[PDB]
mmCIF file of all heavy atoms in Angstrom:
data_model
loop_
_atom_site.group_PDB
_atom_site.id
_atom_site.type_symbol
_atom_site.label_atom_id
_atom_site.label_comp_id
_atom_site.label_asym_id
_atom_site.label_seq_id
_atom_site.Cartn_x
_atom_site.Cartn_y
_atom_site.Cartn_z
ATOM 1 N N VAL A 250 132.690 -40.037 -11.721
ATOM 2 C CA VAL A 250 133.679 -40.535 -12.668
ATOM 3 C C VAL A 250 135.064 -40.050 -12.204
ATOM 4 O O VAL A 250 136.039 -40.750 -12.310
ATOM 5 C CB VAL A 250 133.443 -40.035 -14.075
ATOM 6 C CG1 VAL A 250 134.497 -40.654 -14.977
ATOM 7 C CG2 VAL A 250 132.069 -40.408 -14.579
ATOM 8 N N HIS A 251 135.106 -38.739 -11.800
ATOM 9 C CA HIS A 251 136.313 -38.043 -11.341
ATOM 10 C C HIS A 251 136.884 -38.722 -10.113
ATOM 11 O O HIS A 251 138.109 -38.936 -9.954
ATOM 12 C CB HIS A 251 135.974 -36.583 -11.058
ATOM 13 C CG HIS A 251 135.529 -35.834 -12.314
ATOM 14 N ND1 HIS A 251 134.674 -34.733 -12.257
ATOM 15 C CD2 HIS A 251 135.836 -36.037 -13.646
ATOM 16 C CE1 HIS A 251 134.453 -34.324 -13.527
ATOM 17 N NE2 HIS A 251 135.158 -35.076 -14.377
ATOM 18 N N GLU A 252 136.004 -39.208 -9.290
ATOM 19 C CA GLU A 252 136.501 -39.948 -8.141
ATOM 20 C C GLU A 252 137.251 -41.182 -8.552
ATOM 21 O O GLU A 252 138.272 -41.504 -8.012
ATOM 22 C CB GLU A 252 135.375 -40.310 -7.185
ATOM 23 C CG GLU A 252 135.316 -39.443 -5.939
ATOM 24 C CD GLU A 252 136.668 -39.242 -5.334
ATOM 25 O OE1 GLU A 252 137.303 -40.137 -4.791
ATOM 26 O OE2 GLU A 252 137.104 -38.006 -5.492
ATOM 27 N N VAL A 253 136.718 -41.899 -9.557
ATOM 28 C CA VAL A 253 137.370 -43.131 -10.042
ATOM 29 C C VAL A 253 138.672 -42.846 -10.722
ATOM 30 O O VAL A 253 139.654 -43.611 -10.663
ATOM 31 C CB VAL A 253 136.465 -43.911 -10.997
ATOM 32 C CG1 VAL A 253 137.187 -45.197 -11.455
ATOM 33 C CG2 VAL A 253 135.113 -44.262 -10.305
ATOM 34 N N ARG A 254 138.654 -41.751 -11.425
ATOM 35 C CA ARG A 254 139.777 -41.349 -12.179
ATOM 36 C C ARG A 254 140.984 -41.122 -11.238
ATOM 37 O O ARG A 254 142.108 -41.600 -11.438
ATOM 38 C CB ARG A 254 139.383 -40.104 -12.972
ATOM 39 C CG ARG A 254 140.538 -39.640 -13.868
ATOM 40 C CD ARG A 254 140.639 -40.419 -15.197
ATOM 41 N NE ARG A 254 139.396 -40.279 -15.997
ATOM 42 C CZ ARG A 254 139.154 -40.878 -17.186
ATOM 43 N NH1 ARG A 254 140.052 -41.700 -17.773
ATOM 44 N NH2 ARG A 254 137.966 -40.652 -17.802
ATOM 45 N N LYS A 255 140.666 -40.453 -10.157
ATOM 46 C CA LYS A 255 141.546 -40.076 -9.106
ATOM 47 C C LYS A 255 142.203 -41.304 -8.443
ATOM 48 O O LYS A 255 143.409 -41.335 -8.193
ATOM 49 C CB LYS A 255 140.686 -39.298 -8.147
ATOM 50 C CG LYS A 255 141.393 -38.350 -7.204
ATOM 51 C CD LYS A 255 140.430 -37.876 -6.100
ATOM 52 C CE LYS A 255 141.104 -37.540 -4.768
ATOM 53 N NZ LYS A 255 140.123 -37.412 -3.641
ATOM 54 N N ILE A 256 141.411 -42.336 -8.164
ATOM 55 C CA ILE A 256 141.958 -43.586 -7.548
ATOM 56 C C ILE A 256 142.923 -44.285 -8.506
ATOM 57 O O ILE A 256 143.973 -44.820 -8.116
ATOM 58 C CB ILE A 256 140.829 -44.617 -7.155
ATOM 59 C CG1 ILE A 256 139.770 -44.082 -6.172
ATOM 60 C CG2 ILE A 256 141.429 -45.922 -6.672
ATOM 61 C CD1 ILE A 256 140.317 -43.600 -4.853
ATOM 62 N N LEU A 257 142.500 -44.382 -9.761
ATOM 63 C CA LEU A 257 143.333 -45.036 -10.716
ATOM 64 C C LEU A 257 144.624 -44.220 -10.858
ATOM 65 O O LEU A 257 145.679 -44.756 -11.199
ATOM 66 C CB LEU A 257 142.656 -45.102 -12.080
ATOM 67 C CG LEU A 257 141.490 -46.060 -12.121
ATOM 68 C CD1 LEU A 257 140.801 -45.916 -13.468
ATOM 69 C CD2 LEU A 257 142.017 -47.482 -11.956
ATOM 70 N N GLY A 258 144.493 -42.886 -10.702
ATOM 71 C CA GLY A 258 145.666 -41.940 -10.756
ATOM 72 C C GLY A 258 146.606 -42.063 -11.971
ATOM 73 O O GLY A 258 146.339 -42.769 -12.928
ATOM 74 N N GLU A 259 147.722 -41.318 -11.887
ATOM 75 C CA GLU A 259 148.756 -41.227 -12.930
ATOM 76 C C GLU A 259 149.230 -42.584 -13.383
ATOM 77 O O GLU A 259 149.458 -42.794 -14.567
ATOM 78 C CB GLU A 259 149.934 -40.353 -12.420
ATOM 79 C CG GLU A 259 151.043 -40.118 -13.432
ATOM 80 C CD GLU A 259 150.632 -39.211 -14.562
ATOM 81 O OE1 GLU A 259 149.705 -38.415 -14.527
ATOM 82 O OE2 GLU A 259 151.316 -39.323 -15.656
ATOM 83 N N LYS A 260 149.436 -43.509 -12.425
ATOM 84 C CA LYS A 260 149.913 -44.790 -12.831
ATOM 85 C C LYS A 260 148.893 -45.433 -13.785
ATOM 86 O O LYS A 260 149.248 -46.088 -14.778
ATOM 87 C CB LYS A 260 150.238 -45.694 -11.662
ATOM 88 C CG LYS A 260 150.872 -47.004 -12.146
ATOM 89 C CD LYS A 260 151.658 -47.755 -11.051
ATOM 90 C CE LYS A 260 151.738 -49.271 -11.275
ATOM 91 N NZ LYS A 260 152.671 -49.949 -10.348
ATOM 92 N N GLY A 261 147.617 -45.171 -13.537
ATOM 93 C CA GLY A 261 146.586 -45.778 -14.385
ATOM 94 C C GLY A 261 145.835 -44.795 -15.274
ATOM 95 O O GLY A 261 144.707 -45.041 -15.656
ATOM 96 N N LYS A 262 146.454 -43.681 -15.614
ATOM 97 C CA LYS A 262 145.795 -42.697 -16.412
ATOM 98 C C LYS A 262 145.449 -43.223 -17.815
ATOM 99 O O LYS A 262 144.688 -42.601 -18.549
ATOM 100 C CB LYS A 262 146.679 -41.507 -16.556
ATOM 101 C CG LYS A 262 148.037 -41.893 -17.187
ATOM 102 C CD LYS A 262 148.827 -40.634 -17.550
ATOM 103 C CE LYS A 262 150.039 -40.928 -18.423
ATOM 104 N NZ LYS A 262 150.733 -39.699 -18.845
ATOM 105 N N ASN A 263 146.052 -44.325 -18.203
ATOM 106 C CA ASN A 263 145.746 -44.855 -19.530
ATOM 107 C C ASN A 263 144.646 -45.886 -19.472
ATOM 108 O O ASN A 263 144.278 -46.509 -20.422
ATOM 109 C CB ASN A 263 146.994 -45.382 -20.238
ATOM 110 C CG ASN A 263 148.001 -44.259 -20.614
ATOM 111 O OD1 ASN A 263 149.231 -44.439 -20.511
ATOM 112 N ND2 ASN A 263 147.474 -43.135 -21.128
ATOM 113 N N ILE A 264 144.094 -46.053 -18.327
ATOM 114 C CA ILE A 264 143.092 -47.045 -18.197
ATOM 115 C C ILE A 264 141.762 -46.545 -18.634
ATOM 116 O O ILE A 264 141.341 -45.456 -18.245
ATOM 117 C CB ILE A 264 143.107 -47.591 -16.791
ATOM 118 C CG1 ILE A 264 144.367 -48.458 -16.683
ATOM 119 C CG2 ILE A 264 141.811 -48.401 -16.461
ATOM 120 C CD1 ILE A 264 144.550 -49.070 -15.291
ATOM 121 N N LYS A 265 141.076 -47.307 -19.449
ATOM 122 C CA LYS A 265 139.778 -46.792 -19.882
ATOM 123 C C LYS A 265 138.704 -47.064 -18.856
ATOM 124 O O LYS A 265 138.506 -48.216 -18.365
ATOM 125 C CB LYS A 265 139.361 -47.306 -21.256
ATOM 126 C CG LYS A 265 140.328 -46.923 -22.369
ATOM 127 C CD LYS A 265 140.588 -45.430 -22.443
ATOM 128 C CE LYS A 265 141.968 -45.057 -23.017
ATOM 129 N NZ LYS A 265 142.360 -43.628 -22.806
ATOM 130 N N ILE A 266 138.043 -45.996 -18.515
ATOM 131 C CA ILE A 266 136.998 -46.022 -17.548
ATOM 132 C C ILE A 266 135.700 -45.975 -18.297
ATOM 133 O O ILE A 266 135.439 -45.046 -19.046
ATOM 134 C CB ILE A 266 137.071 -44.824 -16.553
ATOM 135 C CG1 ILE A 266 138.231 -44.889 -15.587
ATOM 136 C CG2 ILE A 266 135.807 -44.631 -15.712
ATOM 137 C CD1 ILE A 266 138.285 -43.575 -14.815
ATOM 138 N N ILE A 267 134.926 -47.005 -18.115
ATOM 139 C CA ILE A 267 133.616 -47.112 -18.662
ATOM 140 C C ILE A 267 132.604 -46.900 -17.564
ATOM 141 O O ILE A 267 132.564 -47.700 -16.651
ATOM 142 C CB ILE A 267 133.433 -48.524 -19.104
ATOM 143 C CG1 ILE A 267 134.353 -48.810 -20.253
ATOM 144 C CG2 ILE A 267 132.001 -48.719 -19.502
ATOM 145 C CD1 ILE A 267 134.681 -47.549 -21.042
ATOM 146 N N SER A 268 131.769 -45.884 -17.636
ATOM 147 C CA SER A 268 130.783 -45.711 -16.557
ATOM 148 C C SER A 268 129.539 -46.524 -16.739
ATOM 149 O O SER A 268 128.970 -46.508 -17.791
ATOM 150 C CB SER A 268 130.386 -44.263 -16.345
ATOM 151 O OG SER A 268 131.552 -43.513 -16.076
ATOM 152 N N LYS A 269 129.066 -47.169 -15.661
ATOM 153 C CA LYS A 269 127.822 -47.961 -15.717
ATOM 154 C C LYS A 269 126.622 -47.168 -15.341
ATOM 155 O O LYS A 269 126.518 -46.708 -14.224
ATOM 156 C CB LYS A 269 127.883 -49.269 -14.921
ATOM 157 C CG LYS A 269 129.023 -50.201 -15.437
ATOM 158 C CD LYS A 269 129.380 -51.419 -14.534
ATOM 159 C CE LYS A 269 128.179 -52.260 -14.054
ATOM 160 N NZ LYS A 269 128.574 -53.394 -13.133
ATOM 161 N N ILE A 270 125.665 -47.017 -16.304
ATOM 162 C CA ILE A 270 124.359 -46.309 -16.063
ATOM 163 C C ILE A 270 123.337 -47.327 -15.587
ATOM 164 O O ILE A 270 123.086 -48.308 -16.285
ATOM 165 C CB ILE A 270 123.898 -45.610 -17.333
ATOM 166 C CG1 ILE A 270 125.076 -44.761 -17.856
ATOM 167 C CG2 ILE A 270 122.621 -44.751 -17.134
ATOM 168 C CD1 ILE A 270 125.274 -43.427 -17.133
ATOM 169 N N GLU A 271 122.900 -47.184 -14.324
ATOM 170 C CA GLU A 271 122.113 -48.212 -13.651
ATOM 171 C C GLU A 271 120.954 -47.679 -12.898
ATOM 172 O O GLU A 271 120.304 -48.403 -12.109
ATOM 173 C CB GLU A 271 123.010 -48.992 -12.636
ATOM 174 C CG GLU A 271 124.448 -49.362 -13.135
ATOM 175 C CD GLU A 271 125.080 -50.553 -12.408
ATOM 176 O OE1 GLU A 271 124.546 -51.663 -12.375
ATOM 177 O OE2 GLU A 271 126.255 -50.290 -11.817
ATOM 178 N N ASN A 272 120.672 -46.412 -13.090
ATOM 179 C CA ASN A 272 119.598 -45.865 -12.291
ATOM 180 C C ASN A 272 119.065 -44.560 -12.835
ATOM 181 O O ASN A 272 119.619 -44.006 -13.789
ATOM 182 C CB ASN A 272 120.029 -45.826 -10.765
ATOM 183 C CG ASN A 272 121.019 -44.668 -10.294
ATOM 184 O OD1 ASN A 272 121.825 -44.097 -11.062
ATOM 185 N ND2 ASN A 272 120.915 -44.309 -9.000
ATOM 186 N N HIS A 273 117.946 -44.054 -12.279
ATOM 187 C CA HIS A 273 117.414 -42.794 -12.825
ATOM 188 C C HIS A 273 118.443 -41.662 -12.884
ATOM 189 O O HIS A 273 118.534 -40.975 -13.857
ATOM 190 C CB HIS A 273 116.169 -42.244 -12.074
ATOM 191 C CG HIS A 273 115.036 -43.235 -11.931
ATOM 192 N ND1 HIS A 273 115.177 -44.433 -11.203
ATOM 193 C CD2 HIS A 273 113.740 -43.161 -12.373
ATOM 194 C CE1 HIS A 273 113.989 -45.056 -11.234
ATOM 195 N NE2 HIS A 273 113.095 -44.316 -11.911
ATOM 196 N N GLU A 274 119.150 -41.461 -11.787
ATOM 197 C CA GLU A 274 120.086 -40.372 -11.657
ATOM 198 C C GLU A 274 121.051 -40.333 -12.773
ATOM 199 O O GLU A 274 121.136 -39.354 -13.549
ATOM 200 C CB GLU A 274 120.801 -40.350 -10.269
ATOM 201 C CG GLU A 274 121.332 -38.910 -9.971
ATOM 202 C CD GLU A 274 122.043 -38.666 -8.641
ATOM 203 O OE1 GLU A 274 122.255 -39.770 -7.878
ATOM 204 O OE2 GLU A 274 122.398 -37.542 -8.325
ATOM 205 N N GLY A 275 121.696 -41.485 -12.899
ATOM 206 C CA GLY A 275 122.591 -41.744 -13.962
ATOM 207 C C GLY A 275 121.919 -41.429 -15.260
ATOM 208 O O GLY A 275 122.469 -40.793 -16.108
ATOM 209 N N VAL A 276 120.684 -41.823 -15.412
ATOM 210 C CA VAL A 276 120.072 -41.460 -16.664
ATOM 211 C C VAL A 276 119.876 -39.965 -16.785
ATOM 212 O O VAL A 276 120.215 -39.346 -17.756
ATOM 213 C CB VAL A 276 118.817 -42.249 -16.983
ATOM 214 C CG1 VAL A 276 118.251 -41.789 -18.332
ATOM 215 C CG2 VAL A 276 119.221 -43.694 -17.111
ATOM 216 N N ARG A 277 119.348 -39.379 -15.771
ATOM 217 C CA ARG A 277 119.114 -37.981 -15.851
ATOM 218 C C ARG A 277 120.391 -37.109 -15.958
ATOM 219 O O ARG A 277 120.349 -35.979 -16.446
ATOM 220 C CB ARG A 277 118.247 -37.541 -14.714
ATOM 221 C CG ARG A 277 117.133 -38.492 -14.397
ATOM 222 C CD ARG A 277 116.188 -37.876 -13.392
ATOM 223 N NE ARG A 277 114.901 -38.524 -13.378
ATOM 224 C CZ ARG A 277 114.406 -39.108 -12.341
ATOM 225 N NH1 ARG A 277 115.082 -39.170 -11.167
ATOM 226 N NH2 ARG A 277 113.186 -39.613 -12.459
ATOM 227 N N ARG A 278 121.503 -37.584 -15.437
ATOM 228 C CA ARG A 278 122.733 -36.762 -15.479
ATOM 229 C C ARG A 278 123.714 -37.314 -16.423
ATOM 230 O O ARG A 278 124.947 -37.173 -16.238
ATOM 231 C CB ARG A 278 123.360 -36.710 -14.108
ATOM 232 C CG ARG A 278 122.340 -36.300 -13.051
ATOM 233 C CD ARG A 278 122.994 -36.106 -11.679
ATOM 234 N NE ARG A 278 123.921 -34.977 -11.595
ATOM 235 C CZ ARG A 278 124.530 -34.591 -10.473
ATOM 236 N NH1 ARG A 278 124.359 -35.259 -9.303
ATOM 237 N NH2 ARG A 278 125.359 -33.523 -10.516
ATOM 238 N N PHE A 279 123.157 -38.005 -17.426
ATOM 239 C CA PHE A 279 123.965 -38.717 -18.359
ATOM 240 C C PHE A 279 124.947 -37.861 -19.123
ATOM 241 O O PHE A 279 126.081 -38.260 -19.374
ATOM 242 C CB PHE A 279 123.114 -39.510 -19.307
ATOM 243 C CG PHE A 279 123.925 -40.178 -20.354
ATOM 244 C CD1 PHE A 279 124.649 -41.326 -20.050
ATOM 245 C CD2 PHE A 279 123.953 -39.680 -21.656
ATOM 246 C CE1 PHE A 279 125.395 -41.987 -21.021
ATOM 247 C CE2 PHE A 279 124.707 -40.315 -22.641
ATOM 248 C CZ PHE A 279 125.455 -41.451 -22.307
ATOM 249 N N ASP A 280 124.493 -36.702 -19.550
ATOM 250 C CA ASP A 280 125.363 -35.814 -20.362
ATOM 251 C C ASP A 280 126.693 -35.513 -19.691
ATOM 252 O O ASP A 280 127.750 -35.634 -20.310
ATOM 253 C CB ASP A 280 124.613 -34.519 -20.740
ATOM 254 C CG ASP A 280 123.670 -34.731 -21.915
ATOM 255 O OD1 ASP A 280 123.874 -35.840 -22.464
ATOM 256 O OD2 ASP A 280 122.824 -33.946 -22.318
ATOM 257 N N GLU A 281 126.658 -35.114 -18.401
ATOM 258 C CA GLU A 281 127.932 -34.827 -17.694
ATOM 259 C C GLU A 281 128.732 -36.094 -17.478
ATOM 260 O O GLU A 281 130.031 -36.146 -17.668
ATOM 261 C CB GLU A 281 127.720 -34.106 -16.369
ATOM 262 C CG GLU A 281 126.795 -34.891 -15.448
ATOM 263 C CD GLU A 281 126.981 -34.462 -14.036
ATOM 264 O OE1 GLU A 281 126.233 -33.462 -13.664
ATOM 265 O OE2 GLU A 281 127.774 -34.955 -13.342
ATOM 266 N N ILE A 282 127.997 -37.168 -17.125
ATOM 267 C CA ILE A 282 128.744 -38.425 -16.944
ATOM 268 C C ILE A 282 129.500 -38.826 -18.201
ATOM 269 O O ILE A 282 130.625 -39.305 -18.141
ATOM 270 C CB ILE A 282 127.841 -39.574 -16.611
ATOM 271 C CG1 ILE A 282 127.297 -39.450 -15.224
ATOM 272 C CG2 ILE A 282 128.721 -40.789 -16.755
ATOM 273 C CD1 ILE A 282 125.877 -40.056 -15.011
ATOM 274 N N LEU A 283 128.796 -38.724 -19.358
ATOM 275 C CA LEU A 283 129.345 -39.060 -20.656
ATOM 276 C C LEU A 283 130.645 -38.266 -20.895
ATOM 277 O O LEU A 283 131.700 -38.819 -21.358
ATOM 278 C CB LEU A 283 128.329 -38.642 -21.742
ATOM 279 C CG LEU A 283 128.267 -39.513 -23.005
ATOM 280 C CD1 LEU A 283 127.825 -38.663 -24.183
ATOM 281 C CD2 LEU A 283 129.582 -40.180 -23.341
ATOM 282 N N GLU A 284 130.512 -36.931 -20.678
ATOM 283 C CA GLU A 284 131.643 -35.978 -20.861
ATOM 284 C C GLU A 284 132.848 -36.366 -20.049
ATOM 285 O O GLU A 284 133.983 -36.351 -20.526
ATOM 286 C CB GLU A 284 131.254 -34.559 -20.537
ATOM 287 C CG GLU A 284 132.257 -33.529 -21.075
ATOM 288 C CD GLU A 284 133.468 -33.392 -20.208
ATOM 289 O OE1 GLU A 284 133.190 -32.836 -19.060
ATOM 290 O OE2 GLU A 284 134.601 -33.732 -20.558
ATOM 291 N N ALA A 285 132.586 -36.780 -18.817
ATOM 292 C CA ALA A 285 133.678 -37.167 -17.970
ATOM 293 C C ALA A 285 134.223 -38.514 -18.306
ATOM 294 O O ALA A 285 135.347 -38.782 -17.983
ATOM 295 C CB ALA A 285 133.330 -37.028 -16.470
ATOM 296 N N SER A 286 133.412 -39.406 -18.938
ATOM 297 C CA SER A 286 133.874 -40.791 -19.155
ATOM 298 C C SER A 286 134.561 -41.053 -20.424
ATOM 299 O O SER A 286 134.476 -40.282 -21.385
ATOM 300 C CB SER A 286 132.784 -41.829 -18.952
ATOM 301 O OG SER A 286 131.895 -41.349 -17.887
ATOM 302 N N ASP A 287 135.211 -42.194 -20.412
ATOM 303 C CA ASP A 287 135.866 -42.709 -21.557
ATOM 304 C C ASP A 287 134.914 -43.537 -22.442
ATOM 305 O O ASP A 287 135.227 -43.890 -23.583
ATOM 306 C CB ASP A 287 136.978 -43.604 -21.080
ATOM 307 C CG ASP A 287 138.216 -42.825 -20.736
ATOM 308 O OD1 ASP A 287 138.514 -41.803 -21.315
ATOM 309 O OD2 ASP A 287 138.971 -43.405 -19.801
ATOM 310 N N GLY A 288 133.767 -43.880 -21.877
ATOM 311 C CA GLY A 288 132.816 -44.766 -22.525
ATOM 312 C C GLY A 288 131.745 -45.146 -21.550
ATOM 313 O O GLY A 288 131.838 -44.853 -20.355
ATOM 314 N N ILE A 289 130.718 -45.799 -22.059
ATOM 315 C CA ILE A 289 129.556 -46.124 -21.271
ATOM 316 C C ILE A 289 129.076 -47.567 -21.399
ATOM 317 O O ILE A 289 129.244 -48.218 -22.443
ATOM 318 C CB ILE A 289 128.391 -45.195 -21.669
ATOM 319 C CG1 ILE A 289 128.711 -43.726 -21.388
ATOM 320 C CG2 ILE A 289 127.156 -45.606 -20.884
ATOM 321 C CD1 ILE A 289 128.930 -43.413 -19.931
ATOM 322 N N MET A 290 128.488 -48.036 -20.302
ATOM 323 C CA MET A 290 127.847 -49.355 -20.270
ATOM 324 C C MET A 290 126.399 -49.155 -19.852
ATOM 325 O O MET A 290 126.122 -48.616 -18.799
ATOM 326 C CB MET A 290 128.555 -50.269 -19.268
ATOM 327 C CG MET A 290 128.024 -51.706 -19.293
ATOM 328 S SD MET A 290 128.966 -52.819 -18.271
ATOM 329 C CE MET A 290 127.870 -53.882 -17.356
ATOM 330 N N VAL A 291 125.506 -49.588 -20.712
ATOM 331 C CA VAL A 291 124.096 -49.552 -20.326
ATOM 332 C C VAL A 291 123.810 -50.804 -19.481
ATOM 333 O O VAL A 291 123.590 -51.881 -20.064
ATOM 334 C CB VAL A 291 123.201 -49.620 -21.526
ATOM 335 C CG1 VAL A 291 121.750 -49.388 -21.086
ATOM 336 C CG2 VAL A 291 123.649 -48.601 -22.595
ATOM 337 N N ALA A 292 123.942 -50.678 -18.116
ATOM 338 C CA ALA A 292 123.722 -51.808 -17.118
ATOM 339 C C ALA A 292 122.200 -52.110 -16.911
ATOM 340 O O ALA A 292 121.519 -51.621 -15.981
ATOM 341 C CB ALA A 292 124.371 -51.460 -15.790
ATOM 342 N N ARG A 293 121.662 -52.868 -17.839
ATOM 343 C CA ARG A 293 120.246 -53.102 -17.906
ATOM 344 C C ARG A 293 119.683 -53.773 -16.679
ATOM 345 O O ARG A 293 118.537 -53.498 -16.269
ATOM 346 C CB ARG A 293 119.856 -53.812 -19.225
ATOM 347 C CG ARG A 293 120.103 -52.876 -20.423
ATOM 348 C CD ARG A 293 119.652 -53.473 -21.759
ATOM 349 N NE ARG A 293 119.842 -54.925 -21.810
ATOM 350 C CZ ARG A 293 119.542 -55.682 -22.868
ATOM 351 N NH1 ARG A 293 119.064 -55.124 -23.937
ATOM 352 N NH2 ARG A 293 119.759 -57.048 -22.832
ATOM 353 N N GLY A 294 120.495 -54.647 -16.079
ATOM 354 C CA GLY A 294 120.064 -55.383 -14.872
ATOM 355 C C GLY A 294 119.420 -54.487 -13.816
ATOM 356 O O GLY A 294 118.215 -54.481 -13.598
ATOM 357 N N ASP A 295 120.251 -53.694 -13.201
ATOM 358 C CA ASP A 295 119.824 -52.789 -12.178
ATOM 359 C C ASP A 295 118.977 -51.741 -12.699
ATOM 360 O O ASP A 295 118.001 -51.311 -12.040
ATOM 361 C CB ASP A 295 121.026 -52.141 -11.517
ATOM 362 C CG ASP A 295 121.645 -53.060 -10.551
ATOM 363 O OD1 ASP A 295 120.834 -53.435 -9.575
ATOM 364 O OD2 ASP A 295 122.727 -53.490 -10.723
#
C-alpha cells in the first residue's frame, strides 16, 4: 500500500487508495493492509 502511496506522493496525497484483496496473502495479511489503506475492494474474480 505504502509503495502506492509513495507514487501518488504529495501531489496526490488526497487520493483515496482502495486496496484490492485478490489472493491468499492478501487475505492472510489483511489486518496490516487494512491499516495502511484508505479502503478495501473484495476482488472476487481473482
Side-chain angles (χ1 to χ4, degrees):
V250 182
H251 297 153
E252 257 315 291
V253 181
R254 182 82 60 182
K255 202 192 150 194
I256 302 301
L257 289 173
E259 183 70 21
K260 185 160 153 171
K262 58 170 192 176
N263 292 141
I264 287 179
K265 299 306 152 193
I266 290 172
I267 293 333
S268 303
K269 301 168 49 182
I270 309 281
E271 318 203 58
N272 77 334
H273 307 63
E274 202 179 6
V276 180
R277 319 189 161 120
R278 309 186 67 176
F279 176 77
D280 280 349
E281 57 160 88
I282 289 149
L283 213 209
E284 196 280 291
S286 326
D287 277 328
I289 298 297
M290 186 173 137
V291 188
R293 293 184 326 181
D295 281 300

